[PDB]
Amino acid sequence: RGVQMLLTTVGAFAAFSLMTIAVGTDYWLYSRGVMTHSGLWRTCCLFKGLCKQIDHFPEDADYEADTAEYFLRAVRASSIFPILSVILLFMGGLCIAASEFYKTRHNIILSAGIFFVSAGLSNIIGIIVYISANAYSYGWSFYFGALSFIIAEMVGVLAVHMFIDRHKQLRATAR
Amino acid sequence: GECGSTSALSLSNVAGVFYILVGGLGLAMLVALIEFCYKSRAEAKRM
Amino acid sequence: EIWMCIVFAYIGVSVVLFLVSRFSPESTNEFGIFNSLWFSLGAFMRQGCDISPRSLSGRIVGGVWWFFTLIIISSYTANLAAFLTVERMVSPIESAEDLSKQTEIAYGTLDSGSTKEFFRRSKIAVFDKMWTYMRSAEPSVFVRTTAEGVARVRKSKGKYAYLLESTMNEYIEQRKPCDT
Amino acid sequence: IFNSLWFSLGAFMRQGCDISPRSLSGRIVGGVWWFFTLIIISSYTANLAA
Amino acid sequence: TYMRSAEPSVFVRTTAEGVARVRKSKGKYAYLLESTMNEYIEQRKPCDT
């Protein structure tokens, strides 16, 4: 019953905020050129201790045959997919709090679960894109970001479960 | 000569299937669900 | 790290199809999270099918999952065998001819001795070529004592070679750290 | 036609299915198809190494 | 006809001019030359030709 609301809220705030943390820093732990941190926007070394914007996808020493670094590197740049995923997460929780009142049993619950689960999916997609773009370890907040997508998916399972259960109350009360 | 005269380990060379087919997952899922909500929508429209 | 992504696709497909069976109720067999989860797992493995999803949406998505596990497992097995077939890394260089045909790993002897004068006076194109290399090599491949060549090669990380008499090479080869 | 197309699709895959031909005539087709795709994806595995 | 009409001029004064010119050309320029020098330089760092 209310446990669905519990897992719903804690999954929304938890996975959402954790995703934001993944956006913040700790994207790749490695030796720089020298060691530095990574957050997909800037790197900060251990001279030692300065920072600089490390999101320099274009580098003027390559071939650039046909939309390899253009399509690939440009797509990976600016973190297109994960931003979309997080925005759709805020849309998810928004449709949750909106779904609290204003019953409309089927529409808002189902739509919210769909956009939320698909949002986590797109988050994992952006993760894959960044991993491909990495072509010696990762950051803590990155791992918490992937796991944030995982827990988001679980919360989606509980969400659609609560939805179809509401449908069971619908056809049940129909009998 | 200064330019000279094996156990390869695939990491992401094959990952290209993911952001296309995996995208097709939510693709066919969404399109399907649209077909279902349209079918049930017309069912409610039959009243 | 690939494995994590693989499991991510696993649970992703599992949740999606679980929604497919759950949605639009009268119920199907994939209606359970152990049915979508377990059956997605057996869909990963080559284990025999148990519950065929009649849903055309679930049908095509499962098909996509056979595109996934078919290729990723195919590559796991094939490339895996391609790895075990290289069981031992043989010596890239074994003869003095190999030495003459490369420059990556340097090589030399003492700064004197019957060996140095030997290669100085040798007439073999291999030996003469190697002599020409070492006498002009930079830095100096010559050393004053045997231990100099020993520690030199040990710190060389395999990038410098030392030539000497067979017996001494045996004695050193039979002594710790046994790294020669 | 969904059973034929989708069972034929999973038939293309190494994975088996629940339904099985029993007409002892189309069953021949399923068998020779296993024999065909067998060497198809098998040889695909062979080249995959190379 | 192309090269004598190529703008800017594809002509240089020394071999190293063509060498570093192609090296910075990112492959967008070709240097036509004698086989021997091409081989010797090809046997030399940064081994990019």
UniProtKB/Swiss-Prot annotation, chain A:
Domain of life, per lineage: Eukaryota
Subcellular location: Membrane; Synapse, Synaptosome
Residues spanning the membrane: 5-25, 78-98, 108-128, 144-164
Keyword terms: Calcium, Calcium channel, Calcium transport, Glycoprotein, Ion channel, Ion transport, Membrane, Phosphoprotein, Synapse, Synaptosome, Transmembrane, Transmembrane helix, Transport, Voltage-gated channel
GO cellular component: AMPA glutamate receptor complex; cell surface; cerebellar mossy fiber; glutamatergic synapse; hippocampal mossy fiber to CA3 synapse; postsynaptic density membrane; Schaffer collateral - CA1 synapse; somatodendritic compartment
GO terms, molecular function: calcium channel regulator activity; channel regulator activity; ionotropic glutamate receptor binding; voltage-gated calcium channel activity
Mode of membrane association: Multi-pass membrane protein
Disulfide cross-links: none
Record's subunit section: The L-type calcium channel is composed of five subunits: alpha-1, alpha-2/delta, beta and gamma. Interacts with the PDZ domains of DLG4/PSD-95 and DLG1/SAP97. May interact with GOPC. Acts as an auxiliary subunit for AMPA-selective glutamate receptors (AMPARs). Found in a complex with GRIA1, GRIA2, GRIA3, GRIA4, CNIH2, CNIH3, CACNG3, CACNG4, CACNG5, CACNG7 and CACNG8. Interacts with GRIA1 and GRIA2. Interacts with MPP2.
Entry function: Regulates the trafficking and gating properties of AMPA-selective glutamate receptors (AMPARs). Promotes their targeting to the cell membrane and synapses and modulates their gating properties by slowing their rates of activation, deactivation and desensitization. Does not show subunit-specific AMPA receptor regulation and regulates all AMPAR subunits. Thought to stabilize the calcium channel in an inactivated (closed) state.
Sequence similarity: Belongs to the PMP-22/EMP/MP20 family. CACNG subfamily.
The name this protein goes by in its record: Voltage-dependent calcium channel gamma-2 subunit
Species annotation: Rattus norvegicus
Gene: Cacng2
Residue window of the full protein shown: 6 to 213 of 323
From Swiss-Prot, chain C:
Residues with PTM Phosphoserine: S122, S156
Subcellular location: Cell membrane; Postsynaptic cell membrane; Postsynaptic density membrane
Protein residues bound to L-glutamate: S114, T115, E165
Transmembrane domains' residue ranges: 1-20, 56-76
UniProt site positions, description: Interaction with the cone snail toxin Con-ikot-ikot: R120
Domain of life assignment: Eukaryota
UniProt PTM comment: Palmitoylated. Depalmitoylated upon L-glutamate stimulation. Cys-49 palmitoylation leads to Golgi retention and decreased cell surface expression. Ubiquitinated by RNF167, leading to its degradation.
Protein name: Glutamate receptor 2
Organism: Rattus norvegicus
From Swiss-Prot, chain E:
Induction / repression: Down-regulated in the pyramidal cell layer of CA1 in the hippocampus by global ischemia.
Chain positions found as Phosphoserine: S25
Annotated compartments: Cell membrane; Postsynaptic cell membrane; Postsynaptic density membrane
Entry PTM: Palmitoylated. Depalmitoylated upon L-glutamate stimulation. Ubiquitinated by RNF167, leading to its degradation.
Residues that coordinate or bind L-glutamate: E34
Coiled coil: none
Recorded superkingdom: Eukaryota
Tissue distribution: Detected in forebrain. Detected in dendrites of neuronal cells. Expressed in the pyramidal cell layers of CA1 and CA3 and in the granule cell layer of the dentate gyrus.
Self-association state and partner proteins as the record states: Homotetramer or heterotetramer of pore-forming glutamate receptor subunits. Tetramers may be formed by the dimerization of dimers. May interact with MPP4. Forms a ternary complex with GRIP1 and CSPG4. Interacts with ATAD1 in an ATP-dependent manner. ATAD1-catalyzed ATP hydrolysis disrupts binding to ATAD1 and to GRIP1 and leads to AMPAR complex disassembly. Interacts with GRIP2. Interacts with GRIP1. Interacts with NSF via its C-terminus. Interacts with CACNG2, PICK1 and GRIP2. Interacts with GRIA1 and SYNDIG1. Part of a complex containing GRIA2, NSF and NAPA and/or NAPB.
Other observations noted: The postsynaptic actions of L-glutamate are mediated by a variety of receptors that are named according to their selective agonists. This receptor binds AMPA (quisqualate) > L-glutamate > kainate.
Family: Belongs to the glutamate-gated ion channel (TC 1.A.10.1) family. GRIA2 subfamily.
Domain notes: The M4 transmembrane segment mediates tetramerization and is required for cell surface expression.
Protein name: Glutamate receptor 2
Gene designation per UniProt: Gria2
